[model samples]
Target: MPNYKLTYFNMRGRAEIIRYIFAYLDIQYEDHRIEQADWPEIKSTLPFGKIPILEVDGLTLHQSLAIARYLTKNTDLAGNTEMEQCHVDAIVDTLDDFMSCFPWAEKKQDVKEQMFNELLTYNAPHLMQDLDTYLGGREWLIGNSVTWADFYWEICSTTLLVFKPDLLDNHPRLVTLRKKVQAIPAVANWIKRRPQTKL
Candidate 1:
């Protein structure tokens, strides 16, 4: 096992995907959440001034998905073949596109609400449809086995559902996939024990 230490905010946010990978792999790693007050000093030390950096093997890995991809290496969580990796990464990147639209750091309340409402109302359906279409009747998002992409869908959708409970009403296949991910023993345990947060 590697000396893994993940540094992120207390919330799941971008870091949950990394956590889920660790959970499913049963890798022992430090889950370090920095206090908001300590961010000023902490931020200055990061490579890109971002959280979710993984300190491992005497090197710091930045970017949430990048770290996730690294952990899934040599395991079925990534993919069995090189081609499957493309399928896996495509879904991961596509899902990220939708999540990136939100005004996460916006301060003005009115603008934030308007943007969020617009995305949920107008933008979400098309993306959901595209995702559902890509998924079709597939059990998982890519290949024959479960991968980090599956974990990502669960993590990202959980956040979306918080804003709109009916978001997946039209996508039963997608819903089933989420449930399947949650039902994984390790992932289930992580979900049950993780610090509860709105985001």
Candidate 2:
């Protein structure tokens, strides 16, 4: 196994999916969460001044999904064929689209309300419905087993759950899918042991 070290904030944020992937595979890695107070000093040392950077065998990697994609190469999380991989990529891209709307909820009072209204009325309904429909009669997002896409969706979807706990009420497929993913032994164990946070 390669020496792995992941650095990010204390919160789940973009790093949790990476952690979940590691946990699911039962791989050992150093999860280094940086304190806010020490960010300034540590910031400049990063390649792009970003969190969620992975150090593998002394090589640094930037971008959360990029790190995930690399890990998928060694595991069954990636599809077996080119076409299936394309499908997985599509779903991950769609999740990226939904994740883009997350910052709307972080805006100041009035802007936050306005943006959230747009998210609830437009973004959430459409994306959630699309995902639900796409997942109809499917066990996982792409092929038959758990993929990085599933982990990505769950991690980002959890952020939305924080903003709107009832968001998946109408998306039964998503709710059920999440439950199935959660039921995996490693994932379930990770959920039980992970730090409790609102976001």
Candidate 3:
């Protein structure tokens, strides 16, 4: 097995997907969480100057998705077939598209609120409705087995709901999907053991 070490902020932020995959795969690795204050000094040490980089067997891998795909390679967590994997990416990318618009680094409060609420009210529901429809009958999102798509949904939706507590009230199926993902024994173990960060 390759020695793995994942470094990211204490918050889930963009690194949660990597964490979820690690848990699902039941891989043992160092989860190195850096403090926000230390990032300034830490920034220059990385290749792309990013967090959530994975150090595997002395090789550094950047980008959370890339690291996740690396770990999930040849595993059912990716998908059972190429077509299933293609659809899996669509869901992750679609969710990311919505998340990308969030004003994470915006310093202005009112501007942030305006954008956040608009996305929560208008954009979020639009995406949720489509996911709800796409997942109309499947216990899992993409195929017969649980894939990264399912894990990503649970992680993303958890954050979204914290932003707008009532966000998923209309989409019960999505909530059920989240629960299903959480119910996985390894995921459940990670959730319980993970740090208590708001994000």
Candidate 4:
């Protein structure tokens, strides 16, 4: 067993992909949470003062996306070919555009509805249309096999439906894609064992 320690704030943010990757690989790691007050003291300890840092063999790796790709390198979660890997990376990066909008919703003290509408009308459809086109009739995101792209897409797609159920009606293929990806044995098991939190 590898001594893996993940240091981050205790939230379902960028660290999620890291956690999901660890879970899918069945790798055990310490999930270290940093309090807001402690962040200043610990910030410089990390190479770039970034949260969601993965510590392996006493070496620290910053950046969530890099850690995700690293975890899936030896595993089959990353796509099979170099080109396929590029496709997967591209798709995942596209999803990040919409994920970036989440901060507006969270920070909305006033005009939360407007913030939500901004996401609902503009961000949601653009990403979903891109997905529907890129993912047309594909079992997985690339090469007919499950990849990190599928994992990222599945989580985002599922959460989209949960938050904005009507979004699915516009993108049925994406809705079905979510179901297909979750049915993967390892992914299904991880979902089953996932820790639930109160909303």
Candidate 5:
């Protein structure tokens, strides 16, 4: 077995996709979470003082999305064709742009609400509309079946339900897509899986 270790904060930041990708592949990994206060020592072991680094065979790989895509490409989860991959990437990047506003918000203050509301109003809705149109009545994002793009979209859609449900309340297809992936047997099972420690 490969020695796979993903170092990140306890909370699901950018590393969540990596976790899901591993789960989709049925591969187990060590989630070495670090407390925010522990960064002083943790920074020395990683590149650019960042978390979410993936280590395999003592070779450390930085960049969460890159790791996720690498694993996805090796597995069946990533789409088959280059065109499909491009569209998947485009959709994932577009969704990322919408969610980048709220990286990690501890308090739901009025300021945060206003900022998020602006994102919902001016950014998310239009993207969702366009995405739904582009989906064009397909079951998945790019090809005929589920791909990592679908998983990424599912995670993103679930995220919106938490921060901005009203934005997608009217978008039936998007909601359906989210629910569909959430109900996937592997993903649903993985959703219940948790780290032994609360780090």
Candidate 6:
């Protein structure tokens, strides 16, 4: 196996899904979390001056999703066929749509309120409903077993729950999906052993 080292901030943020992929695979990796005070010095060392970089053997890879895709390559989590992979990729893009709401936190009070209201009241629930319908009573997002899509949705859903506690009350399928992902043995063990942190 290749030596893997993942560097990111102490927070779960963008790197958590990748971490989930590792845990799901039961792979060993070095988790290097940088402190905020140390980022400026460390930032210049990174290819893009951004974090969640994955060092494989000696080659370094930037971008959270790219690293995740690489880590999940050839695994059951990546899907078994071209069309299944397309479905997984589509779900990942859908997650990006929901996560775009994170930027609303940086806006002015009025603007933030407008965006949050629309998100918490309209867009967020709409996305969850769409995902629920896409699930169609299936146990997993792509096929019968776990995939990157499930892990991506799990992280996105967790982030949204932190942003809006009651966002999923109307989408029971998503709530169930969250529980299903958490219930996996490796994921459950990871949750048990990993440090608890607020998003």
Root-mean-square deviation of each candidate, in angstroms? Answer: 0.9, 1.8, 1.0, 2.5, 2.8, 1.9
RMSD of 2: 1.8
- What is the C-alpha local distance difference test score of each model? 0.91, 0.84, 0.89, 0.78, 0.78, 0.85
Better of 2 and 5 by TM-score: 2
- How far residue 168's Cα lies from its native spot in candidate 3, in Å, is 1.2
lDDT of 2 by residue, 1-199 (tens): 7999999888888888888889988999999988889999989888799878999999999898888888888578888778888898889888887676655336488787777667866778788888888888989988888888888888878888877788898888898788888888999999999888666
**lDDT (Cα, tens digit) per residue for candidate 6, span 1-199:** 9899999888788889889988988889999998889999999887789888989998999988888888788888898898999888889988986787655337488877777677777788778888889998898889878898898898888877886899888888888888999999999898899867786
Model 2, poorest ten-residue lDDT window?
A: 98-107
Q: Tens-digit lDDT track for model 3 on 168-188?
A: 889999999999999999999
Give the range where candidate 4 is weakest over 10 consecutive residues by summed lDDT. 190-199
Model 1 earns a TM-score of: 0.97
Instruction: Tell me the tens digit of each residue's lDDT in model 1 across 73-93.
Output: 988798878999998999899
Q: lDDT of candidate 3?
A: 0.89
* Candidate 1 vs 3: which has more lDDT: 1
Which candidate would rank higher by TM-score, 4 or 6? Answer: 6
Error of 1 at 30 (Å): 0.7
Which residue segments of model 2 deviate by more than 4 Å? 104-109
User: What would the TM-scores of all predictions be?
Assistant: 0.97, 0.92, 0.97, 0.85, 0.88, 0.92
Q: Backbone clashes per model, in order? A: 0, 0, 0, 0, 0, 0
Q: Model 5, stretches more than 4 Å misplaced? A: 103-111, 195-199
Where model 4 places Cα greater than 4 Å from the true spot, the runs are: 35-40, 104-108, 111-113
- TM-score: model 5 vs. ground truth: 0.88
| lDDT tens readout by residue for model 4, 133-155 | 88888777789777888888877
Task: Note the residue pairs that clash in candidate 5.
Answer: none
